């Protein structure tokens, strides 16, 4: 069995954020979801990931050509969901069109290391495209092309065996 460890599902588009802080982003309804990290991780390295949609055809309106640049990432609390400083993790980036088909679907693969006790990860859109500012007068905080179908984990450090 290839075990996956599933931390979110979310249906909503994702939010357009710059790194703010926790209280900025929570303040703008970036939804988000808290890991436990257990004392036998603190401070080690482990693999978490996300299944992401890029859908821009037509999205608010916007041009079925029109080229949209992506960069989702993760920030997390470098302390516990009461803390504010916010780290960056990102993977890849993509360009052009996006039609959204799932069998594009991309994967937010990132290498995160953290102390024990509880972080709140924030799924977001790094990149405002320029295109969706002047088209669709997309700003910070709002809903971006960008969609984190499901947040998880296939690290053998990180799910239960079955
Ligand atoms: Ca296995
Ligand atoms: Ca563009």
Known sequence: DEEIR??????????????????????????????????????????????????????????????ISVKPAFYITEGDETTDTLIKYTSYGSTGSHSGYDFDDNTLDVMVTLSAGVHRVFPVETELDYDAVQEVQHDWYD???????????DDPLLTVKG
């Open 6 to 67: 599933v931390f979110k599902e979310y249906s909503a588009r994702a939010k357009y954020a710059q790194n703010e802080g926790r209280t900025a982003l929570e303040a703008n309804n970036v939804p988000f979801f808290d890991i436990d990290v257990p004392p036998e991780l603190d401070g080690v390295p482990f693999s978490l990931k996300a299944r992401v949609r890029h859908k821009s055809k037509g999205v608010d309106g916007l041009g079925d050509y029109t080229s």
């Open 143 to 153: 809903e971006s092309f960008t969609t984190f179908i499901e947040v998880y984990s």
